[PDB]
Design an enzyme around this catalytic site. Structure first.
Site, PDB file in Angstrom:
ATOM      1  N   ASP A 100      95.512 -38.445 -35.594  1.00  0.00           N
ATOM      2  CA  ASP A 100      94.970 -37.360 -36.383  1.00  0.00           C
ATOM      3  C   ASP A 100      95.561 -36.083 -35.779  1.00  0.00           C
ATOM      4  O   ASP A 100      95.254 -35.720 -34.642  1.00  0.00           O
ATOM      5  CB  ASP A 100      93.438 -37.350 -36.302  1.00  0.00           C
ATOM      6  CG  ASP A 100      92.802 -36.246 -37.144  1.00  0.00           C
ATOM      7  OD1 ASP A 100      93.501 -35.342 -37.619  1.00  0.00           O
ATOM      8  OD2 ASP A 100      91.579 -36.271 -37.316  1.00  0.00           O
ATOM      9  N   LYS A 128      95.078 -25.470 -40.556  1.00  0.00           N
ATOM     10  CA  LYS A 128      94.968 -24.549 -39.450  1.00  0.00           C
ATOM     11  C   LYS A 128      96.233 -23.845 -38.989  1.00  0.00           C
ATOM     12  O   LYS A 128      96.205 -22.634 -38.807  1.00  0.00           O
ATOM     13  CB  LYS A 128      94.248 -25.218 -38.279  1.00  0.00           C
ATOM     14  CG  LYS A 128      92.802 -25.588 -38.584  1.00  0.00           C
ATOM     15  CD  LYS A 128      92.657 -27.073 -38.893  1.00  0.00           C
ATOM     16  CE  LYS A 128      91.182 -27.478 -39.048  1.00  0.00           C
ATOM     17  NZ  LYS A 128      91.002 -28.866 -38.639  1.00  0.00           N
ATOM     18  N   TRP A 184      85.322 -35.461 -33.925  1.00  0.00           N
ATOM     19  CA  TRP A 184      85.022 -34.663 -35.110  1.00  0.00           C
ATOM     20  C   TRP A 184      84.007 -35.530 -35.851  1.00  0.00           C
ATOM     21  O   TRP A 184      84.277 -36.704 -36.121  1.00  0.00           O
ATOM     22  CB  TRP A 184      86.311 -34.518 -35.930  1.00  0.00           C
ATOM     23  CG  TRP A 184      86.211 -33.691 -37.187  1.00  0.00           C
ATOM     24  CD1 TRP A 184      85.656 -32.453 -37.316  1.00  0.00           C
ATOM     25  CD2 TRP A 184      86.750 -34.029 -38.474  1.00  0.00           C
ATOM     26  NE1 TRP A 184      85.828 -31.990 -38.599  1.00  0.00           N
ATOM     27  CE2 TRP A 184      86.495 -32.930 -39.328  1.00  0.00           C
ATOM     28  CE3 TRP A 184      87.427 -35.142 -38.985  1.00  0.00           C
ATOM     29  CZ2 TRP A 184      86.901 -32.921 -40.668  1.00  0.00           C
ATOM     30  CZ3 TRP A 184      87.827 -35.128 -40.316  1.00  0.00           C
ATOM     31  CH2 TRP A 184      87.562 -34.020 -41.137  1.00  0.00           C
TER      32      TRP A 184
HETATM   33  C1  LIG Z   1      90.269 -29.778 -39.327  1.00  0.00           C
HETATM   34  C2  LIG Z   1      90.374 -31.105 -38.970  1.00  0.00           C
HETATM   35  C3  LIG Z   1      90.593 -32.039 -39.954  1.00  0.00           C
HETATM   36  C4  LIG Z   1      90.551 -31.648 -41.399  1.00  0.00           C
HETATM   37  O1  LIG Z   1      91.766 -31.393 -42.015  1.00  0.00           O
HETATM   38  P1  LIG Z   1      91.596 -30.617 -43.359  1.00  0.00           P
HETATM   39  O2  LIG Z   1      92.946 -30.093 -43.701  1.00  0.00           O
HETATM   40  O3  LIG Z   1      90.614 -29.415 -43.080  1.00  0.00           O
HETATM   41  O4  LIG Z   1      90.944 -31.548 -44.294  1.00  0.00           O
HETATM   42  C5  LIG Z   1      90.784 -33.336 -39.628  1.00  0.00           C
HETATM   43  N1  LIG Z   1      90.731 -33.723 -38.316  1.00  0.00           N
HETATM   44  C6  LIG Z   1      90.505 -32.831 -37.339  1.00  0.00           C
HETATM   45  C7  LIG Z   1      90.452 -33.298 -35.936  1.00  0.00           C
HETATM   46  C8  LIG Z   1      90.322 -31.520 -37.643  1.00  0.00           C
HETATM   47  O5  LIG Z   1      90.081 -30.650 -36.656  1.00  0.00           O
END
Ligand SMILES: *Cc1c(COP(=O)(O)O)cnc(C)c1O
Ligand SMILES: *Cc1c(COP(=O)(O)O)cnc(C)c1O
EC number: 2.6.1.1
Lengths: 396, 396
Positions: free
Chosen positions: A211, A246, A130
């Protein structure tokens, strides 16, 4: 003061929103940032969420400050989602969770915490990853180094290259791992590979930073937590950053967490006090709404049942879409075979397009995707699938 | 990694919540952090807010990301609250506003922006000031210097000392000003003094940074914006950080803004792009809920009428409380005269107690206040006023 300030380069993901906003062509197809769209191309608020919101509307009696780490109930519910009901970490009280402003806020808080409270200087990020990962860590003052991951030719995880490159990672270095649905490749390590990484990690002395932004989008809540759990079983210390943007469709309410794991409760507490200090000097306390919605759902068995079914529907629609996508590309005459896309977890398609191919797509077809060749499958609908495939075939 | 980490010292304001939480004595009086309490000692959610929330519940159709700077409508409504309906800044398009996670997030964003995009090295903060000011700026890497403000003896603003000390402030230095209801003194400069500061500021070349957390709590929305407006009329550049935590009672929803003012639209835009970059690497985008509630109210004339009346009621209750407070202290036999408290704007009482006097208050009376001798008048109710005054008199 502001005379010589340079214009900042547009974000590779977020920058699409603006270009798109300025494109008056009607048949625009937005396959850029990773948000879920339903069959109609709308990104709706989940029914389980609406219900939690009516509940809050009716029972919330104050808006008083939340406390640096946020809603306690929320923190506990996320710990079980991550580590599991009877996890040793929960029962030995080795984990402290802080409610943060999204998954990004979680990464920023961890980085500020690390930069100022430990001897961490380097963070290892996969290639690719990312885009905002490098940025977050660099703004905290940390050097970011990359490790091999994707095999552009075979469209798989080059496990040996990964191991080899990580041999340059020294003890005390932070190694960032995507819990599941690797952004942008969609290729995740097998449980066996996770176990190998866990032992190599303990042996070399790396500080794992997970993450987790798509838990439940690969196979299921628990299954997607397998890698982390194999790591949580052998490590004394860990840092986990998660997002509920998400899997709960609460993108703009900024719901996330940052969990600290230490050898024992006494150490985790000392360490956590410093994380709270890092938070107090950033945004003070987290936004209540989004997290209240998450705590209410997860805490109520009826609402939880509806939610889990909604997640399942979301995952299933994307699975159907990528299969239909490959099939339509076949009937449209795509010269290249895109079967590998089916082996990818999450919302994305990655590996079959070049930077120029994606520029030409927006340029003359109005199809918007990330310049890396990353397409959001969760944005394809039965209606736009045909026009989409015709543009791609015209570009191959 | 976490073996040698030291326990962080408790926050002087937020730390009270925990001590208080661990004190099982029934007659506890919480006069610590600055939140509004009604006659019953509850900190309720405003009726205008609830109504905005039902509206959102019924009409919100998505939870999709907000865009780095947040809700546009929200940004515009705050600009008029700050600069005024027909402000030159609005019409010349010299101001860019970003929705942030509270007033603290606004200060942090400005600091990160300054630290990395300008030659700012020092920030001048009043003595005394909100404790978290030094922390916020120091975490961004900026040196913080203090300027005289309060006269402990006369309980007034020592204007000459202020001017004198600010002579050490060089061009290019940031000078932080509290828009109104100075935390913790409650002493604000007269409009005449504001005008003097504005001209001295332009002449010396300081970069004004206004902290607005209590707009509407001194005299009224517009009146409280007088100082800033006298500054906005003569300056080419400014930074304004505001909070809606207190005047909308939306403490935990984290609603605030960071406004950038430049000589022209072209410069403000270049500068703003860098502020958005500083945001993207922090929390990405701001929490929607709280700001939606603020935009709905301010944007709807009926809801706005109710809100403005609620603010008025809040201000009036505090005014009545501090007068009754002085009166009760008189009848309880307070040796010291506290009439000056009446000349203080906002929620606080400051200047009559020592660190030991406040320790003894919690220690044996269970009355909680900030160690600086700052008491939250907005937390006094007709019911606790007597017991409160008896403890204070027993301590003088
Ligand atoms: C979407 C995403 C984030 C961001 O999280 P938010 O809640 O949108 O700040 C962090 N890491 C990855 C890999 C993501 O896909
Ligand atoms: C309350 C306060 C803040 C904090 O704003 P939040 O919205 O609570 O983050 C900032 N500055 C001053 C002077 C305050 O009183």
């Amino acid at each position: 003061m502001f005379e010589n300030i340079t214009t900042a380069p547009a974000d590779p993901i977020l920058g699409l929103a603006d270009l798109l906003r300025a494109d008056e062509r009607p048949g625009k197809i937005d396959l850029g940032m990773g948000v879920y769209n339903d069959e109609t191309g709308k990104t709706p608020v989940l029914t389980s969420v609406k219900k939690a919101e009516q509940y809050l509307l009716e029972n919330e009696t104050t808006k008083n400050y939340l406390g640096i780490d946020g809603i306690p109930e929320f923190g506990r519910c996320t710990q079980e989602l991550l580590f599991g009901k009877g996890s040793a970490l929960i029962n030995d009280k080795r984990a402290r969770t802080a409610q943060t402003p999204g998954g990004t806020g979680a990464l920023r808080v961890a980085a500020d915490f690390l930069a100022k409270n430990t001897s961490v200087r380097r963070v290892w990020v996969s290639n690719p990853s990312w885009p905002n990962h490098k940025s977050v860590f660099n703004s905290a003052g940390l050097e970011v180094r990359e490790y091999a991951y994707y095999d552009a030719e075979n469209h798989t995880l080059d496990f040996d290259a990964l191991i080899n490159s990580l041999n340059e990672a020294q003890a005390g270095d932070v190694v960032l791992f995507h819990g599941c649905c690797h952004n942008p490749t969609g290729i995740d390590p097998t449980l066996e590979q996770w176990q190998t990484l866990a032992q190599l990690s303990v042996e070399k002395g790396w500080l794992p930073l997970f993450d987790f932004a798509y838990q439940g989008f690969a196979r299921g809540l628990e299954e997607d937590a397998e890698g982390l759990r194999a790591f949580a079983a052998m490590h004394k210390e860990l840092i986990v950053a998660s997002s509920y943007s998400k899997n709960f469709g609460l993108y703009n309410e900024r719901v996330g967490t940052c969990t600290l794991v230490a050898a024992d409760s006494e150490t985790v507490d000392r360490a956590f006090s410093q994380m709270k200090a890092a938070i107090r000097v950033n945004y003070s306390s987290p936004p209540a709404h989004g997290a209240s919605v998450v705590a209410t759902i997860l805490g109520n068995d009826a609402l939880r049942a509806i939610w889990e079914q909604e997640l399942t529907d979301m995952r299933q629609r994307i699975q159907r879409m990528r299969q239909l996508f490959v099939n339509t590309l076949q009937e449209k005459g795509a010269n290249r075979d895109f079967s590998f896309t089916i082996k990818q977890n999450g919302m994305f398609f990655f590996g079959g397009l070049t930077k120029e191919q994606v520029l030409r797509l927006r340029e003359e077809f109005g199809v918007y995707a990330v310049a890396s060749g990353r397409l959001n499958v969760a944005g394809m609908t039965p209606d736009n699938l045909a026009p989409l495939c015709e543009a791609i075939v015209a570009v191959l």
